[PDB]
Design a binder for these strands. Structure first.
Lengths: 39, 207, 157, 259
RNA sequence: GAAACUGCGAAUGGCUCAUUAAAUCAGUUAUCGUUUAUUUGAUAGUUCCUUUACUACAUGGUAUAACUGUGGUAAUUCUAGAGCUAAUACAUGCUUAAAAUCUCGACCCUUUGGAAGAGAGUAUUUAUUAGAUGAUGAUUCAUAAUAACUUUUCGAAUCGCAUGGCCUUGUGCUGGCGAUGGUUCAUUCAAAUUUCUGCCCUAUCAACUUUCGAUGGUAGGAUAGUGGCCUACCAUGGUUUCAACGGGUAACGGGAAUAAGGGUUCGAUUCCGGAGAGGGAGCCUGAGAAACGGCUACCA
């Protein structure tokens, strides 16, 4: 259980991180989608 | 039961103020703890003494009664080593604390330059021992010794006051820690604004 | 040499920069503690470029302001950076169905920044206990003119 | 005072418990838990006076002490005479697989809503605080005193989450902003459910909020009392006493005895 | 099951204004100013790296009762001396099986990711740096670090059933699950302050308050921690006819809702809410007492 602690944490950590790159990728992805039609 | 309830006072309009409550235990007031120094074991063998007091929450609070060594930091350089404090001078609060070399949070004292001297040497190639032999570098100037230069050239214009201090072996510094509260005694090394000033208090104090 | 020593035995800041600043020998070294209590309050110009070391200030210290905010006329200028503001209100009288006049006196702390004067309206904030009486700090000062007796002066301000 | 109180008086125990005035003299005092004293329903109350499964006091003592486990709160077993079941909770009666919502009336009395094995899965959580803690990590906290690790970042402090108890998973949240549905956890207006109109913050230390609903009534309460029962008109849970809307004493009469 | 050990509450109340004209108390303060059992929630890889006979954890040492007994004495909650044994209590304590384990990542090698070779815990201190890249109005805020340097921590020698699955075949596990912990945070627990309205009369109260506090402001120190609270150190303060200084009222002390109109009524002899448990003193518990109903010792 001591061991399973840092395991579950790495899983959630990399999990979050993996999500962030996908969200942020989209956050900036909509940035040219919104500023494009204004052009 | 040395209390501190604000009841035994006189409201704004100085009229005495009533009481119906016996002194209640949460108004605790612990016996003061003057803090001396062992930079003179002429009698005092046991160098430093710290007694822990059982505080409210259930925690312990260490109380400094007698000491001899604290920790200090050189503002400028960001260095901090544990050193032996020397004699207390000018306590501001009162001169008696100096007369009994007592340790107040903000008591200005002296320390051993040794750790700082030792360091300033290793990182800059400058011992600070009597001026002439000033530097002490390497024989060959091709490798990493090229850095002690780069740093040394950082116009390490350490105030004319900081310099004199080192050589004399003594160093000026003020404290920043309640001995009667945490048991320790930590201080910063004196410089610019306050240095110049506190010294003045000392020059004129004796003269 | 003046603002620093002036009797008292030292006057630094909360952000202990100073002497170390001599390390950043190029940009701006003369730092002072800067803040902004917010709550719809402008931070005094004088407060920033001052040499004053008032720990009990709401812009030069870790002194907060919370809840109760006051507006009242000033009574006395004496005391070191502390002033007494007098508030003038009416009290109702159940029976006679009318009012009477009344005045509460208040201990207010004044950061050097704003300049006092006797008989002017002042705005205090709710700051932690600073002393027996004090429990209010000045945050906004309005100069006002009353030709004489401050006591006579009674305004439902 | 001597130390810390430890009992509770019949007379002094909340009107939300619809308690027996003549009853006794005391009343099971809520145990320090997930919900505050006033905002809670200790189990003993929940079974004896509420469900009525229990009866006499010892009746409970059996139920929660019996080696069978008959009571579940948010997918967990409980054996405390006065566990403070709070707002938006899910209680299951093992031996019958009963699932309930801990929700206030429209008249402010604690009501027990019967759920289908379906809703019994999700529970609505309101966001307490939100800040980053140890080793660069984000934490969110719910009224239900839930502490959350690595939560979706698009969540502001005054949010409302849908919780999948089965997987201890989050899904579809929704902050409080002009145009949502809400439940008021406490106040001269509790038990109501309407559309948020606008939130005027006054910072001086107390922001307020307005609301509309079915008969388009105007509601006013402090933010701390707003719980987002849903995003954009669609509520997220079945409400007790029909829709979260109370009637004039006049409307009650006309609806019941039709005057 | 005897008994003991435990380990718990035994700071709870309950009667008591006796005081008390005082914020008492009411509202009316968050507390950037203070403490926090209770309750959860959470939860904790960096402890060596000795220059792994780490011994080797086929989880240490003690210590003790209780206990059998030997007793004493006008006589104790008496107690003596004899022996015992526990232990969820003292007192600990390498965490290996090598190169521990942390932390880059080439790279492919595609996943099993392979990942090279990339690099390496905390109570207690300051001291800087964060903080551009959480938050406040708000921060010197955090929670960061950061070194140092701290007679300083931290860290389940738990027990409970659940031991049948895994491979091994003894094995290695398998620990399941809880009980039994610790950790810090907020988690209610709190208190604890705290603004902001309000006791009887009185101007025949005019004036008041300053030796250390009357004030400010400051050094410290206490305070657990805010505070003149004090050490100082000084500021002269300022209060005040809206009567302030002040005086005088034994003063312990004061929540529900209906309601054209009316009908009626409530909480229940005070919701509220400070100060006594011979005198005095000091001390006591502790999360947590101005500990009444703990002491002592003193007096009686």
């Amino acid at each position: 259980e001591k061991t399973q602690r840092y395991v579950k944490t790495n899983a959630a950590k990399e999990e979050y991180e993996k999500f962030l790159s996908e969200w942020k990728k989209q956050r900036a992805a909509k940035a040219h989608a919104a500023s494009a039609p204004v052009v | 039961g040395i209390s501190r309830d604000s009841k035994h006072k006189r409201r704004a309009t100085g009229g005495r103020m009533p009481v119906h409550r016996k002194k209640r235990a949460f108004e605790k007031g612990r016996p003061i703890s003057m803090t001396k120094l062992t930079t003179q074991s002429t009698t005092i063998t046991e160098k430093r003494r710290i007694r822990p007091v059982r505080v409210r929450g259930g925690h312990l609070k260490f109380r400094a009664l007698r000491l001899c060594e604290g920790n200090f930091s050189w503002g400028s350089e960001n260095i901090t080593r544990k050193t032996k404090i020397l004699d207390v001078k000018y306590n501001a609060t009162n001169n008696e604390l100096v007369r009994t070399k007592t340790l107040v949070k903000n008591s200005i004292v002296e320390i051993d330059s040794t750790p700082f001297r030792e360091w300033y040497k290793l990182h800059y190639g400058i011992d600070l021992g009597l001026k002439k032999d000033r530097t002490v570098l390497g024989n060959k100037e091709k490798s990493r010794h090229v850095q002690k230069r780069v740093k040394r050239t950082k116009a390490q214009a350490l105030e004319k006051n900081i310099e004199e201090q080192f050589v004399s072996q003594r160093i000026l510094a003020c404290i920043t820690s309640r001995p009667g509260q945490s048991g320790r005694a930590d201080g910063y090394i004196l410089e610019g604004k306050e240095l110049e000033f506190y010294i003045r208090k000392l020059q004129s104090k004796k003269k | 040499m003046d603002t620093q020593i002036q009797r008292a035995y030292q006057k630094q800041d909360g952000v202990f920069l100073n002497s170390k600043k001599l390390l950043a020998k190029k940009t701006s070294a003369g730092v002072r503690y800067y803040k902004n209590i917010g709550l719809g309050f402008k931070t005094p110009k004088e407060a920033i470029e001052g040499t004053y070391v008032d720990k009990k200030c709401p812009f030069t210290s870790n002194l907060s302001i919370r809840g109760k905010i006051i507006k009242g006329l000033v009574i006395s200028t004496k005391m070191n950076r502390t002033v007494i503001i007098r508030r003038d209100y009416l009290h109702y009288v159940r029976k006679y169905n009318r009012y009477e006049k009344r005045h509460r006196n208040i201990p207010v702390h004044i950061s050097p920044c704003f300049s006092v004067k006797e008989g002017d309206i002042l705005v205090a904030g709710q700051c932690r206990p600073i002393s027996k009486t004090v429990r209010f700090n000045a945050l906004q000062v309005v100069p006002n003119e009353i030709i004489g007796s401050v006591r006579k002066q009674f305004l439902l301000f | 005072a001597r130390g810390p109180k430890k009992h509770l008086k019949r007379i002094n125990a909340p009107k939300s418990w619809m308690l027996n005035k003549l009853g006794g003299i005391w009343a099971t005092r809520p145990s320090q838990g997930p919900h505050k004293l006033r905002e809670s329903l200790p189990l003993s109350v929940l079974l004896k006076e509420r469900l009525n499964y229990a009866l006499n006091g010892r009746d409970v003592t059996l139920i929660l002490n019996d080696k069978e486990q008959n009571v579940f709160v948010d997918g967990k077993v409980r054996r405390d005479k006065g566990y403070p079941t709070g707002l938006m909770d899910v209680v299951r009666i093992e031996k019958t697989d009963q699932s309930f919502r801990i929700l206030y009336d429209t008249k402010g009395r604690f009501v027990l809503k019967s759920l289908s094995k379906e809703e019994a899965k999700y529970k609505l959580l309101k966001v307490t605080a939100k800040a980053i803690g140890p080793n660069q990590i984000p934490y969110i906290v719910t009224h239900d005193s839930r502490t959350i690790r690595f939560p979706n970042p698009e969540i502001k402090i005054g949010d409302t989450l849908k919780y999948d108890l089965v997987n201890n998973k989050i899904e579809n949240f929704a902050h409080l902003e002009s145009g949502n549905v809400c439940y008021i956890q406490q106040g001269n207006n509790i038990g109501r459910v309407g559309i948020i109109q606008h939130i005027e913050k006054h910072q001086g230390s107390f922001d307020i909020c307005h609301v509309k609903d079915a008969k388009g009534n105007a509601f006013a309460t402090r933010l701390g009392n707003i719980f987002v029962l849903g995003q954009g008109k669609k509520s997220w849970i079945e409400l007790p006493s029909g829709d979260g809307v109370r009637e004039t004493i006049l409307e009650e009469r006309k609806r019941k005895f039709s005057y």
